[PDB]
Each structure stands twice: as structure tokens, then as C-alpha cells.
Amino acid sequence: QCRRLCYKQRCVTYCRGR
């Protein structure tokens, strides 16, 4: 799966792997 977190104008998509 993947996870998206947005804070302080910082959005990123972290998915399984590393």
C-alpha cells in the first residue's frame, strides 16, 4: 500500500519498498 502525508505545505507519497 501507499501513504500520503500533508503538512506545512509538504505533501509526499510513500509506498512499500524502501
The technique by which this structure was obtained is: NMR
Tell me which residue has cell 503538512.
Answer: 7
> Beta strands 2-7 and 10-15: pairing type?
antiparallel
Report the distance separating Cα 6 and Cα 17, nearest Å. Answer: 20
6 backbone dihedrals φ, ψ, rounded to 5°: -120, 125
Cβ–Cβ < 8 Å for 15, 4: no
12 backbone dihedrals φ, ψ, rounded to 5°: -145, 150
Report the distance separating Cα 15 and Cα 18, nearest Å. Answer: 8
Half-sphere exposure of 11 (CA within 13 A, CB side): 2
